[PDB]
Amino acid sequence: PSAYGSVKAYTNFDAERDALNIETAIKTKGVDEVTIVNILTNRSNEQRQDIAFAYQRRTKKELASALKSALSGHLETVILGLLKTPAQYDASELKASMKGLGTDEDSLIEIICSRTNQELQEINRVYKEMYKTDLEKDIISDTSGDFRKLMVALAKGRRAEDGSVIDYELIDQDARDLYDAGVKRKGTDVPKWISIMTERSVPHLQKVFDRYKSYSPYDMLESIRKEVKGDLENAFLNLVQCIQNKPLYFADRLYDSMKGKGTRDKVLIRIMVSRSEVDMLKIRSEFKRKYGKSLYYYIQQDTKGDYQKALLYLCGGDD
Ligand SMILES: [Ca+2]
Numbered sequence: 001p002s003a004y005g006s007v008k009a010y011t012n013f014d015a016e017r018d019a020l021n022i023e024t025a026i027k028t029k030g031v032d033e034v035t036i037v038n039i040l041t042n043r044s045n046e047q048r049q050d051i052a053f054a055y056q057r058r059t060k061k062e063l064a065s066a067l068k069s070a071l072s073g074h075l076e077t078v079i080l081g082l083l084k085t086p087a088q089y090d091a092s093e094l095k096a097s098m099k100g101l102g103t104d105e106d107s108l109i110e111i112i113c114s115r116t117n118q119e120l121q122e123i124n125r126v127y128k129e130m131y132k133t134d135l136e137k138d139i140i141s142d143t144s145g146d147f148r149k150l151m152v153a154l155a156k157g158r159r160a161e162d163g164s165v166i167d168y169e170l171i172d173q174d175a176r177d178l179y180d181a182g183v184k185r186k187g188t189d190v191p192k193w194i195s196i197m198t199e200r201s202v203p204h205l206q207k208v209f210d211r212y213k214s215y216s217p218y219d220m221l222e223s224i225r226k227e228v229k230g231d232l233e234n235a236f237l238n239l240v241q242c243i244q245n246k247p248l249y250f251a252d253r254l255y256d257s258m259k260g261k262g263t264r265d266k267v268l269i270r271i272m273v274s275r276s277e278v279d280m281l282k283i284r285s286e287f288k289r290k291y292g293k294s295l296y297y298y299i300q301q302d303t304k305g306d307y308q309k310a311l312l313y314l315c316g317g318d319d
């Protein structure tokens, strides 16, 4: 399990009954949107799985397929998202970010840099089973240059696992290499960075990055913005953020999605769904710490409707 996320497993749970009340809410005219939301966002994900089981074995029509028709707009996006299992959701968002070589580079980057070894493996599996083709191929297909190399590497999900002894020598050797390969040099040995940052264990890389500051006048992030540019730079930046502080990373991503004119709902929804039973609690705390007001608050301000309520239940608290 994971004790660090909002939207905990609903106690008292009755799958059979819930599926009834959802039908009811659908069967109603205008849809009791309100109920559907009030239910599905206060149930854990597996709980939703046996509700879709129960709703199919009680009507002979698949719940997701039913709600697609029952709903519209960003609310649909949300709920439809929640019904998928974690791996399926990730897989689907991934595929949809590549639908054409007019790819949505940003969304790809996010899911890849943030997702862990286990998560990644399960995704690769589900992706192949879902779309009859390898995720690695689809990545290669829609990316180019160094960027491709990076994303592939990352998506293999073969990060060295958390070695339980601390390699103080290596940490130094790596930091050095990153410096030598980047800032110290004219131009940049990109494949080194890709190598070190993809392969090493995360708690190793955290320490590498803090050591790096002993050789370089700019921290790892600043070094990235200087030494490289483009979609590669964007990736590196995201990656580093995920290693140093992932809750914070997601917090910032959430902020950017609302701060300005209108809203980047595609991102906001994805994050709220995906991280609801993972690190949402840590995210909210980091967010509040940095931005002064709650996440709840920005979400409240930037979105409205039944939809807004869904998002709040997913945030799951006021802070
Ligand atoms: Ca209505």
Ligand SMILES: [Ca+2]
Pocket (backbone or CB within 6 Å): 068, 069, 071, 072, 073, 076
């Ligand atoms: Ca629809």
Ligand SMILES: [Ca+2]
Pocket (backbone or CB within 6 Å): 102, 103, 104, 105
């Ligand atoms: Ca594009």
Ligand SMILES: [Ca+2]
Pocket (backbone or CB within 6 Å): 182, 183, 184, 185, 186, 187, 188, 227
């Ligand atoms: Ca340089």
Ligand SMILES: [Ca+2]
Pocket (backbone or CB within 6 Å): 257, 258, 259, 260, 261, 262, 263, 302
């Ligand atoms: Ca806004």
